[PDB]
Design a protein around this nucleic acid. Structure first.
Ligand SMILES: [Mg+2]
Ligand SMILES: [Zn+2]
Ligand SMILES: [Zn+2]
Ligand SMILES: [Zn+2]
Ligand SMILES: [Zn+2]
Lengths: 49, 82, 528, 115, 93, 87, 88, 67, 575, 45, 259
RNA sequence: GAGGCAGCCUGGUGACAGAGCCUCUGUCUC
């Protein structure tokens, strides 16, 4: 073990990946929330290009 | 300087009018005597303007010249524009 | 470091001595109120309860100040503190015992800001002394500051969410300065240009123009409505301009009661033709386009911005010169309150009807453009044939670009005057362009006829691709379509390329706004 | 925070007079009526009814400001007829019109229900 | 903590270019969708040169012509056209 | 106060004489210790010297009845073991 | 024009092109307190200290910084109680 | 979220017409005929149902705090 | 080109550029190139045939998707400098045989020209009918419109959120608004807008609103404020705890109210909270026997506790969030917008009695001034009110996509005629106060308006001897601190030009940082002064007998001490 | 004690001063404060 | 010098609306009549709510907002209730309020629509209009969600809040062919003719009448349901008469003090 | 990726977030 990489939500390495709309609602996720951001210390963060 | 060879104009400037009224209003609020028969007025800044238009405010204006001399003008000696 | 505490902006001198944060000040959004005098401001009742003025106790007022103390801070009419001769202050917020409600001469009571208190009122950037003027307080419901719309002209204010700062003067000696030096009525005329800084504007100006036509006849019940708003009126109803078959007054005849004293003034309306002063009817003006005020009475002519605007020698300038500030206060206040109440009968609007022209006009516009574009093709044929020869001192390219700019500037103005001639006297764009309240004859041309050439840094749209403007055009295409001539009106809608070129031109205006707003205080600081 | 309570548009506070009568000193036989907690609903009918009286020389109304709920009505009359009488008359004429209009609506109802 | 710190602060280096990693805007859904599609040019905001702020011809179909912020950021902060795709790269082998 | 109120009619700039600093300073032996505190309370000749001002929001200072607000703060000095350039 | 003139007079009254730059101002005869409010606050006061300069307290910024009635407008004159006219 | 009780402009009740409106659309009515059949004559009322978005059908996917 | 279209050896994202005059061929597989899909054109024909649309229609259950369109060689990704080498048709109209031939060798075709716009620019109807600065103002204002921001907003404890009660989808919609999911999560309401000069309260950019619509919930919203709080153990023997404080144990106890707290030291949801109510009781042990760290509800709010949740943080200390809600019924001063850069505050609210009404009894929800239109040339705002009046009557949602040659203001006018309205959308109104017809026929229609994040009760502020800074002893900074307003350099510049010297010394001194120093007469340096002993001294001179009192700003005393720390002697001479 | 509701299995559990927050029967770590019992009055406006 | 003598025709009457025509009255009176229809006819509507549980997806004042808007049958008891300002009791009593109750829990496995049908009242006179025509949806509940609340309805009128406005609309028209020229059409041929128009297809306006004034006012009062549409109109005429006779009394008392 | 001044400075206010033990960043408003 060398460290932790923060994972981009709904990326292929997220736990929300591939879930269907019915599954995300069980997690209290929004099915329309696009992901594509990180959570750090509970704050959603966007890497502007 | 004496009341002779005054070179400043006999008009009271707006700045002198502003400060004379402000000063006299503050005096009237500090229970100075009133030099005019008031007619139901009670605001010291309205009484001040009544004393001004009557020419009754007991103030002398000292106007400094840029050479460092000064002229004294009684408020009654000055013409009021308004 | 110690130097860094002092170095400059936000350092001690500039940051805390040449400017600083102050007690007894308030800020909120501003909103209109046409029911205010130019010398009034509408203050939220919460703000008026939060800010106090220390009033000295005297036998002239102690009976009143005992009540405001006895009401205390939970009421709006009340006081926050009593200051003793010692400077010891009783706080009235938390119920003090009767020993501390005692009042004697020379105490200061921190009474709440009342109706008729005087305040300085300001908007940043404070570009000239007319951006800080004295107002008289009127307390109102709700949380915004209200100012009369004429007073928006000095401040450069508008009600799209602007905020303004109120400063409450705290002593009679500085209360008197603001009254005697800085009140809005004393600020009507500016030493920068001896013009008046305040005019009539927006609805009142478009209504003023419409109200003053010959066509405006008013029945007895309408007149008695308008005359209810004149504060200066003497109570004498004027004999109507028409007595039979039906009593009718005229708009000019009631405006002649708004105009103060015996002012004498002459102006022209914006549409006054060039010939009319030289041919017959030098007087008895056909279109009523020549304004004549005599003895304080509006004898003839349509009033507009040329007459009641902020320019020199306007009817409202001459009012200030002849009558002074105290009366010209009332002149601005009366023009608005009667003529905004008349616009409840006329109304005003703009819609899709006003942005449309006859099928005759649209064919005139299309035939103008179709020739202009074919003329530009002829100039190109000359250049490509090497038949074009340069103007003196100019490059061949500069010659070509000037000739093409010539043809298309002609087309923009030929179609624009065709569109304006096409406008019926009912048209509501015309009703604002002719009053001058808003808009201009180029806006009418762009909405109805042709948006025109789009420029980047004063040139036809650049070849930002290799020898062409966009991937859609072939290379070396100098024609009007290729280089950013928007041959469509806003009603016709832009084509895709025209929409992009119109964004390229609009961006330069957005950049230059940011650059010029990035400088507003710079020169004024160095000068001062 | 600064919202006026909505009942304060029509309920008087303690010691508000509903009406106040002041002689207009500008011109003879003129008078000024201040009506608390009323609006265009009651101003415009009394103006219109006053304008029918041939002994009324001026009638007009305004609300001084829309955010505070009162009307001022100004009435001028010929000599030998007070504006107090003109105002009291105009009210009684409106009460007579409304009760007469009401009775005729009740009849028209029955004629429409039972027919 | 090295990957976490710059994502937490936006400072793109060891404690640098600031203003990467803004907080995701959660005022309205169009805000959120725009924030995830925003682009930034690192040129300093204090200079008065207009040329980098102008809408170049080659933004056609790639970057939104209409959307840019007010103030000193004008024309530098930009947003993608709805069908604009940014390549992710391959090896040329 | 007993003293006459006066306007300031001129400002004279200059440099403090190092003897005037010694004469002016209330830290009669100079600052000697990097520490702020003795037994938690302030160290005389340390960087919170109770003659050099009022320390606490309700305190006093040794040189005048300072009331926190009324005390202007008083100057101290460090005697530099060797002269040094003022930058 | 009376404003355009007053700028052109001030820019030239001292006999040279008085550019309104930092040193263009910091060659004026104005006092050290006014100069420190513009461009180079500390460096101005170092040279005032090293040369023992003085400020006569007769500019506006000067009297502002020390909280006294500016030599301007409503301040530029003085008032005396007419103790004789107080009789009437 | 949920259909307004009143039309904002005029005070006509529309909070009882939403489920009927969807039923009429299930019956392959147009929105025009469905609004007509419901008695929504004024365009100020027709815009209430024609433009409503029943997001409460999305809030009820999430399980409550208490079962 | 062939291999990339077949996707054989070359990934379709590879870009390839012959530069024929340079005799260079360049190939880029580099990351971070920006590119866009274009339809391929061969021999003046699209390669996209009707069969492709049929298969794309079956996408609901058939496997065929966009990948199969790319893999077929029917669309191509092209980058910002391969575009230097293409000829683009704007529509397949450009491929048609024409009497005068512009180009006969197109290589690609634009898919739809409106796809040059972005997210916030695609929620705008008829943007090809607007002055382009106003399309930019909306794209900024769109991001500030309230709506529903995400569906799971009840679990999220976001520090600020605004959710609208009754958002609607627009009656007038750009097709791209589908992909934005603006139907599912809309941010506005269709409102009846009269473009009329009414009583004048909509002058400049102000707006009049129907108060009876506001009573019925028009643009009503709720505001959510979330407070986090965190327990800890500090060192060996200091602890914070959430608990109900008490004045017999906690030093910092206010006279404010702690009885809203439960025994855990937290409120429970459903309790009514106001500014300076304690929402969390927190204490820390003191070496009284605790200091008070309780959090207070941020002042000038009133609300109700919506949720309280309690957890362990990363370190295992008790960690807490409280969410508070308050409803915001729109006031005058609240800011609204039209999707066309027509921002504006509510200037007054008139009840349904007083709003101008049509023969049908329709009052407007909003009245805006006509003077907002001529200089700004937001003609798209007028066409929306027309297309929306047709759409609300037809029972349709109107296609306001830009560059749509199939729609015209003439065609929309014709359709409006058939419903018994004047074809240009004017309507005869009656004055609400007097009932008389208005002489002008007002333009009325349904228009999509927005409520923006900016509200007057966030912004209303006043100062009157509040808190004071430690160093400067001047007023604090900013509304949140009860801060005073900055009377800046340009403000004093005006008060000089006004000659208001006594106001200027009031506002810039006696109403900010008044102070007194004693000064030695013999040298201009501050004297020691024992006001309650009546003794004074100039250490430096041994003067004990001739010392002045001098009023001066505290920030000026501070400057002179900060100058003395640089060895400068700013000697103030009173003589 | 207070009663808090688990965020994962919606069960009540009683919980108390200084007691760590964890949920019996499932081990989940977020709790909600139930809802108040004192009366609040709304205008239907 | 005295009152107008107006006359009425009723041209349509239903449970939903009345059409009627008033002739020979002032436009001022015709307008103040339609103003009273909107805002000074009293009705009963829910004004107080105490929520004892709410587990729905709407917050407590979102539901209480919707309860206020539900139209309650008012016809018979509004005249008998006092205003809550007038009654001498502390808090409420049957003299000035109508008590309502609503308890719902969704125990079934599928969405329970809570509606006006679930509001339950202390008396029969006062039920929701949709029960006195599908019921107004208050909230939708998921399985395990719950809503129980106690409410009171009170007498008031549409000046206080639009929940007390009894009308779903008020048409008002006069001079339907523009004989008075109180509006001026820039192209009169492009205007649809009014319902009450009396013109052929080709003539576009009545020719100008310089002698005329407004004389014939066309109304269409539509009820929301709290009152029958004709008892709205009778309540307005009785109320507006009461407003004027309140003036006349207080005016007479002031004359007996000016004099 | 631009000046200018003798390394620093780039026009007035304003409002919120984030990061750190009051300071810094970003976005936004007129
Ligand atoms: Mg503005
Ligand atoms: Zn001391
Ligand atoms: Zn409706
Ligand atoms: Zn000394
Ligand atoms: Zn659990």
């Amino acid at each position: 073990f060398i460290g932790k990489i923060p994972i981009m939500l709904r990326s292929t390495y997220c736990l929300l990946n591939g879930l269907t709309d019915r599954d995300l609602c069980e997690l209290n996720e929004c099915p329309l929330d696009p992901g594509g951001y990180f959570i750090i210390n509970g704050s959603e963060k966007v890497l502007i290009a | 300087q004496a009341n002779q060879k005054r070179i400043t104009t006999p008009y009271m400037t707006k700045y002198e009018r502003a400060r004379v009224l402000g000063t006299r209003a503050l005096q009237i609020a500090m229970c100075a005597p009133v030099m005019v028969e008031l007619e139901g007025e009670t605001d010291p800044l309205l009484i001040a303007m009544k004393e001004l238009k009557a020419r009754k405010i007991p103030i002398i204006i000292r106007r400094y010249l840029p050479d460092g001399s000064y002229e004294d003008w009684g408020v009654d000696e000055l013409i009021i524009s308004d | 470091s110690l130097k860094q505490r002092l170095k400059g902006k936000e350092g001690r001198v500039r940051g805390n001595l040449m400017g600083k944060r102050v007690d007894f000040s308030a800020r909120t959004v501003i909103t209109p109120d046409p029911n205010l005098s130019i010398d009034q401001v509408g203050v939220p009742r919460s703000i008026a309860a939060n800010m106090t003025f220390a009033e000295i106790v005297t036998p002239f007022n102690i009976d009143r100040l005992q009540e405001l103390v006895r009401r205390g801070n939970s009421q709006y009419p009340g006081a926050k503190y009593i200051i003793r001769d010692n400077g010891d202050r009783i706080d009235l917020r938390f119920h003090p015992k009767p020993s501390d409600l005692h009042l004697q001469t020379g105490y200061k009571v921190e009474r709440h800001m009342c109706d008729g208190d005087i305040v300085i009122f300001n908007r940043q950037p404070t570009l000239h002394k007319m951006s800080m003027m004295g107002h008289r307080v009127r307390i109102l419901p709700w949380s915004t500051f209200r100012l009369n719309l004429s007073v928006t002209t000095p401040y450069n204010a508008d009600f799209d969410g602007d905020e303004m700062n109120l400063h409450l003067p705290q002593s009679l000696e500085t209360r008197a300065e603001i009254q005697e030096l800085a009140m809005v009525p004393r600020m009507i005329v500016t030493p920068q240009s001896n013009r008046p800084v305040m005019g009539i504007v927006q609805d009142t100006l478009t209504a003023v123009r419409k109200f003053t036509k010959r066509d405006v006849f008013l029945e007895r019940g309408e007149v008695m409505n308008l005359l209810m708003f004149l504060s200066t009126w003497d109570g004498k109803v004027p004999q109507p301009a028409i007595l039979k078959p039906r009593p009718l007054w005229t708009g000019k005849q009631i405006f002649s009661l708004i105009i103060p004293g015996h002012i004498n003034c002459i102006r022209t309306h914006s549409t006054h033709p060039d010939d009319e002063d030289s041919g017959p009817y030098k007087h008895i003006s056909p279109g009523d386009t020549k304004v004549v005020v005599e003895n304080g009475e509006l004898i003839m002519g349509i009033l507009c911005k040329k007459s009641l605007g902020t320019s020199a020698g306007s009817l409202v300038h001459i009012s200030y010169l002849e009558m002074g500030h105290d009366i010209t206060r009332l002149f601005y206040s009366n023009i608005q309150t009667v003529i905004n109440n008349w616009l409840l009968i006329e109304g005003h609007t703009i819609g899709i009807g006003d942005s449309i022209a006859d099928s005759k006009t649209y064919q005139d516009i299309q035939n103008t453009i179709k020739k202009a574009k074919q003329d530009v093709i002829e100039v190109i044929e000359k250049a490509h044939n090497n038949e074009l020869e340069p103007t003196p001192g100019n490059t061949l390219r500069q010659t070509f670009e000037n000739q093409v700019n010539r043809i298309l500037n002609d087309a923009r103005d030929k179609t624009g005057s065709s569109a304006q001639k096409s406008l019926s006297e009912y048209n509501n764009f015309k009703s604002m362009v002719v009053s001058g309240a808003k808009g201009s004859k180029i806006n009418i041309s762009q909405v109805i006829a042709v948006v025109g050439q789009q420029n980047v840094e004063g040139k036809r749209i650049p070849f930002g691709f290799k020898h062409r403007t966009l991937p859609h055009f072939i290379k070396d295409d100098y024609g009007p379509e290729s280089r950013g001539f928007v041959e469509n009106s806003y009603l016709a809608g832009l084509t895709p390329t025209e929409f992009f070129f119109h964004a390229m031109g609009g961006r330069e205006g957005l950049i230059d706004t940011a650059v010029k707003t990035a400088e507003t205080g710079y020169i004024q600081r160095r000068l001062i | 925070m600064n919202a006026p309570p909505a009942f304060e548009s029509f309920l008087l506070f303690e010691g508000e007079k509903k009406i106040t009568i002041n002689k207009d000193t500008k011109v003879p036989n003129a008078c000024l009526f201040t009506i608390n907690k009323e609006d265009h609903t009651l101003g415009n009918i009394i103006k219109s009814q006053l304008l029918k009286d041939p002994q009324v020389l001026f009638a007009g109304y305004k609300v001084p400001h829309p955010l505070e709920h009162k009307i001022i009505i100004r009435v001028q009359t010929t000599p030998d007829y007070s504006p107090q009488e003109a105002f009291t008359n105009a009210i009684t004429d409106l009460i007579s019109e409304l009760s007469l209009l009401e009775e005729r609506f009740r009849v028209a109802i029955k004629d429409k229900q039972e027919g | 903590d090295g990957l976490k710190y710059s994502l937490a602060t936006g400072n793109w280096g060891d404690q640098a270019r600031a203003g990467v990693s803004q907080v995701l805007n959660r005022l309205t859904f169009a805000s959120t969708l725009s924030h995830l599609r925003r682009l930034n040019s690192p040129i300093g905001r204090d200079g008065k040169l207009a040329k980098p702020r102008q809408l170049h011809n080659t933004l056609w179909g790639m970057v939104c012509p209409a959307e840019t912020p007010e103030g000193h950021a004008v024309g530098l902060v930009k947003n993608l056209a709805l069908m604009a795709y940014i390549s992710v790269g391959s090896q040329p082998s | 106060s007993a003293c006459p109120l006066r306007t300031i009619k001129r400002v004279q700039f200059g440099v403090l004489s190092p003897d005037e600093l010694k004469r002016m300073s209330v830290t009669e032996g100079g600052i000697k210790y990097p520490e702020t505190t003795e037994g938690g309370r302030p160290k005389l000749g340390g960087l919170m010297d109770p003659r050099q001002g009022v320390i606490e929001r309700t305190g006093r200072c040794q040189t005048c009845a300072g009331n926190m607000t009324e005390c202007p703060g008083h100057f101290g000095h460090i005697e530099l073991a060797k002269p040094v350039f003022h930058v | 024009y009376r404003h355009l003139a007053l700028l052109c007079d001030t820019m030239t009254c001292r006999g040279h092109l008085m550019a309104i730059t930092r040193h263009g101002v910091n060659r004026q005869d104005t006092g050290p307190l006014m100069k420190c409010s513009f461009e180079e606050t500390v460096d101005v006061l170092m040279e005032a200290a090293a040369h023992g300069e003085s400020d006569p307290m007769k500019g506006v910024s000067e009297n502002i910084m020390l909280g006294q009635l500016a030599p301007a407008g409503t301040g530029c004159f003085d008032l005396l109680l007419d103790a004789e006219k107080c009789k009437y | 979220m949920i259909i307004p009780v009143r039309c904002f402009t005029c005070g006509k009740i529309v909070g009882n017409k939403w489920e009927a409106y969807l039923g009429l659309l299930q019956a392959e009515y147009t929105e025009g005929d469905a609004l007509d059949a419901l008695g929504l004559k004024r365009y100020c009322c027709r815009r209430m149902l024609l433009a409503h978005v029943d997001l409460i059908e999305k809030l009820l996917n999430y399980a409550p705090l208490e079962k | 080109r062939k291999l990339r279209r077949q996707m054989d050896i070359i990934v379709s994202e590879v870009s390839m550029i012959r530069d024929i005059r340079e005799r260079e061929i360049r190939i880029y597989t580099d990351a971070g190139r920006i590119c866009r899909p274009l339809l391929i054109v061969e021999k003046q024909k699209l390669l996209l045939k009707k069969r492709h649309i049929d298969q794309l229609k079956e996408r609901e259950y058939n496997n065929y998707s966009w990948q199969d369109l790319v893999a077929s060689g029917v669309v191509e990704y092209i980058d910002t400098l391969e575009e230097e080498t293409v000829m683009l048709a704007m529509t397949p109209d450009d491929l048609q045989e024409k009497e005068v031939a512009y180009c006969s060798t197109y290589t690609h075709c634009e898919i739809h020209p409106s796809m040059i716009l972005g997210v916030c620019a695609s929620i705008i109807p008829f943007p090809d009918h607007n002055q382009s600065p106003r399309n930019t103002y909306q794209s900024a204002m769109g991001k500030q419109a309230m709506g529903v921001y995400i569906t799971n907003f009840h679990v999220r404890m976001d520090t600020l959120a605004h959710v609208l009660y009754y958002p609607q989808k627009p009656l007038v919609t750009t097709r791209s608004m589908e992909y934005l999911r603006f139907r599912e999560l809309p941010a506005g309401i269709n409102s009846i807008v009269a473009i009329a000069s009414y009583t004048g309260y909509n002058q400049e950019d102000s707006v009049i609103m129907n108060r009876s619509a506001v009573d019925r919930g028009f643009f009503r919203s709720v505001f959510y404020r979330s407070y986090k709080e965190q327990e800890s153990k500090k060192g060996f023997d200091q602890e914070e705890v959430f608990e109900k404080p008490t004045r017999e144990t906690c030093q910092g106890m206010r006279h404010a109210i702690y009885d809203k707290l439960d025994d855990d030291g937290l409120i429970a949801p459903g309790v009514r909270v106001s500014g300076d109510d304690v929402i969390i009781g927190k204490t820390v042990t003191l070496p009284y026997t605790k200091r008070d760290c309780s959090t207070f509800l941020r002042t000038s709010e009133t609300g109700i506790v919506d949720q309280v949740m309690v957890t362990l943080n990363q370190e295992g200390y008790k960690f807490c969030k409280i969410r508070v809600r308050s409803v915001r019924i729109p006031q005058i001063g609240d800011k609204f917008a039209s999707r066309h850069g027509q921002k504006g505050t509510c200037g007054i609210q008139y009840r349904q009695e007083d709003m101008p009404f049509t023969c049908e009894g329709i009052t407007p929800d909003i009245i805006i001034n006509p003077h907002a239109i001529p200089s700004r040339m937001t003609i798209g705002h007028l066409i929306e009110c027309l297309q929306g009046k047709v759409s609300a009557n037809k029972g349709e949602i109107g296609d306001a996509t830009p560059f749509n040659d199939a729609v015209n203001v003439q065609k929309i006018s014709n359709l409006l005629s058939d419903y018994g309205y004047h074809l240009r959308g004017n309507e005869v109104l009656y004055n609400g106060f007097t009932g008389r017809k208005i002489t002008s026929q007002i333009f009325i229609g349904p228009t999509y308006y927005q409520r923006l994040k900016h509200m007057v009760d966030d912004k209303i502020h006043s100062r009157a001897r509040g808190p004071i800074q430690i160093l400067n002893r001047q007023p604090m900074e900013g509304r949140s601190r009860d801060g005073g307003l900055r009377f800046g350099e340009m403000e004093r510049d005006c008060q000089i030009a006004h000659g208001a010297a006594q106001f200027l010394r009031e506002r810039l001194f006696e109403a900010s940082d008044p102070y007194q120093v004693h000064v030695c007469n013999l040298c201009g340096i501050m004297a020691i002064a024992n006001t309650r002993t009546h003794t004074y001294e100039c250490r430096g001179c041994r003067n004990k007998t001739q010392i002045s009192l001098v009023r001066m700003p505290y920030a000026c005393k501070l400057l002179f001490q900060e100058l003395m720390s640089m060895s400068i002697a700013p000697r103030m001479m009173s003589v | 004690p207070m009663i808090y509701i688990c965020g994962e299995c919606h069960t009540e559990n009683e919980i108390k001063s200084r007691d760590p927050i964890r949920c019996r029967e499932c081990g989940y770590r977020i709790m909600y404060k139930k809802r108040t019992k004192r009366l609040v009055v709304f205008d239907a406006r | 010098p005295y009152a107008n003598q107006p006359t009425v025709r009723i041209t349509e009457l239903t449970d939903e609306n009345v059409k009627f025509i008033i002739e020979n009255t002032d436009l001022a009176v015709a307008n103040s009549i339609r103003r009273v229809f909107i805002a000074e006819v009293p009705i009963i509507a829910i004004d107080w709510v105490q929520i004892d549980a709410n587990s729905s997806v709407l917050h407590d004042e979102f539901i209480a907002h919707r309860l206020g808007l539900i139209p309650l049958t008012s016809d018979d008891i509004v005249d008998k209730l006092q205003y809550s300002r007038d009654c001498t009791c502390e808090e409420f009593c049957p003299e000035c309020s109508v008590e309502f109750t609503l308890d719902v829990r969704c125990n079934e496995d599928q969405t329970r629509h809570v509606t006006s049908r679930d509001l339950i009242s202390n008396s029969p006179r006062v039920i929701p209009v949709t029960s006195r025509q599908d019921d107004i949806l208050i909230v939708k509940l998921r399985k395990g969600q719950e809503l129980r609340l106690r409410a009171y309805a009170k007498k008031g009128f549409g000046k206080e809040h639009a929940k007390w406005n009894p009308t779903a609309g008020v048409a008002f028209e006069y001079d339907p062919d523009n004989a008075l020229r109180h509006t001026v059409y820039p192209k009169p041929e492009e205007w649809p003719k009014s319902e009450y128009s009396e013109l052929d297809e080709d003539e576009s306006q009545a020719p100008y009448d310089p002698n005329g004034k407004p004389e014939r006012f066309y109304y269409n009062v539509e009820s929301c349901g709290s009152l029958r549409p004709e008892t709205i109109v009778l309540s307005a005429l009785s109320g507006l008469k009461k407003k004027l006779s309140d003036l006349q009394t207080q005016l007479s008392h002031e004359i007996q003090s000016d004099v």
